[PDB]
């Protein structure tokens, strides 16, 4: 079964095999007085691994690398952060010290700098406009437009029809928007629609936090977001 928040002490990381050569990583972290789970992705990239997002902090990200070495045994050589918040770049300095080349879009790198968060080394070109997509090893990177944040990316693994939605996608059980300080509530439903249009055959959809599901997570997130706009 998919690991849940109460099963992972802060500082430990679980790996979950989704398909051949595709894993999610699950960690936990405190935020505003509570502990939350958080998802990232690992994809086999030939003899190497591509990492999508840190495990939300330096300690968790170190545990992530150790679990990968123990369970998979291939080197993590590149990482992509899908926006500038700490559950996505927190741990970049550990990745860099371990030998991982870290990447994000120019906007994400800039917003991380403005926020005082860790900054991926390398800029991803070709993602500056809504609807832009680029290839990056075994995945496609997609910028759907502003949603959870103005810079948020999603990631598709064609070999397995896996869609990693990041924090722009909510889990089914999450019924309130919660913290949306950096969100663009007006654009978020439109951005979700671009994800739907671009990946209509996604069979496994991973939210930024919580249990994976299917394409139903997209309408579910629009429902939550629009309900927040009404009142």
Ligand X SMILES: C=CCCn1cc(C)nc1C(=O)O
Q: Binding residues for Zn ion, per CB under 5 A?
A: 85, 87, 167, 208
Residue with tokens 């009142």: 231
CA torsion sign for 158, 168, 176, 54 is positive
Determine if residue 122 is labeled as part of a ligand binding site.
yes
Point out the residue whose Cβ comes nearest to ligand X: 167
Does 179 qualify as catalytic in the annotation? yes
Does 148 qualify as catalytic in the annotation? yes
The pair phi, psi for residue 73, each rounded to 5°, is 80, 10
How far is residue 225's CA from residue 204's CA, in Å, rounded to a whole number? 21
CA torsion sign for 14, 71, 23, 82 is positive
How does DSSP classify residue 161?
T
The site partner of 31 among ligand X, Zn ion, none (C-beta below 5 to 8 Å per kind) is: ligand X
Exactly one of 39, 85, 86, 151 is catalytic; name it: 85
SS3 letters for 54-92? Answer: CCCCHHHHHHHHHHHHHHCCCCEEEEECCCCCHHHHCCH
Least distance between ligand X and beta carbon 52 (Å): 15
The pair phi, psi for residue 169, each rounded to 5°, is -115, 130
Does 198 qualify as catalytic in the annotation? no
Q: Which residues bind to ligand X, rule: CB under 6 A? A: 31, 36, 85-87, 148, 167, 178-179, 208-209
Question: CB-wise, 37 or 138, nearer to Zn ion?
Answer: 37
Determine if residue 47 is labeled as part of a ligand binding site.
yes
Determine if residue 25 is labeled as part of a ligand binding site.
no
The site partner of 178 among ligand X, Zn ion, none (C-beta below 5 to 8 Å per kind) is: ligand X
Binding residues: 12, 47, 83, 85, 87, 122, 138, 148, 167, 171, 209, 220
The binding site for Zn(2+) consists of 47, 83, 85, 87, 122, 148, 167, 209, 220
Q: What residues act catalytically? A: 83, 85, 87, 148, 179
């Amino acid at each position: 079964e998919y690991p849940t928040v109460s099963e992972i002490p802060v500082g430990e990381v679980r790996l979950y095999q989704i398909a051949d050569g595709v894993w999610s990583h699950i960690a936990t972290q405190s935020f505003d007085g509570a502990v939350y789970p958080s998802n990232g992705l690992i994809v086999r990239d030939g003899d190497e691994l591509l990492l999508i997002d840190t495990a939300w902090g330096a300690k968790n990200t170190a545990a992530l690398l150790a679990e990968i070495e123990k369970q998979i045994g291939l080197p993590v050589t590149r990482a992509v952060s899908t926006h500038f918040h700490d559950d996505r770049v927190g741990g970049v300095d550990v990745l860099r010290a371990a030998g991982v080349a870290t990447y994000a879009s120019p906007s994400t790198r800039r917003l991380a700098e403005v926020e005082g968060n860790e900054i991926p080394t390398h800029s991803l070109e070709g993602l500056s406009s809504s609807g832009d997509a680029v290839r990056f090893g075994p995945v496609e990177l997609f910028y759907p437009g502003a949603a959870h944040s103005t810079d948020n990316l999603v990631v598709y693994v064609p070999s397995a029809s896996v869609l990693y939605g990041g924090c722009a996608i909510y889990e089914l059980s999450r019924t309130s928007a919660g913290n949306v300080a950096d969100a663009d509530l007006a654009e978020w439903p439109t951005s979700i629609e671009r994800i739907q249009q671009h990946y209509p055959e996604a069979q496994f959809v991973i939210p930024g936090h919580g249990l994976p599901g299917g394409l139903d997570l997209l309408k579910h997130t629009t429902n939550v977001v629009k309900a927040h706009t009404n009142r």
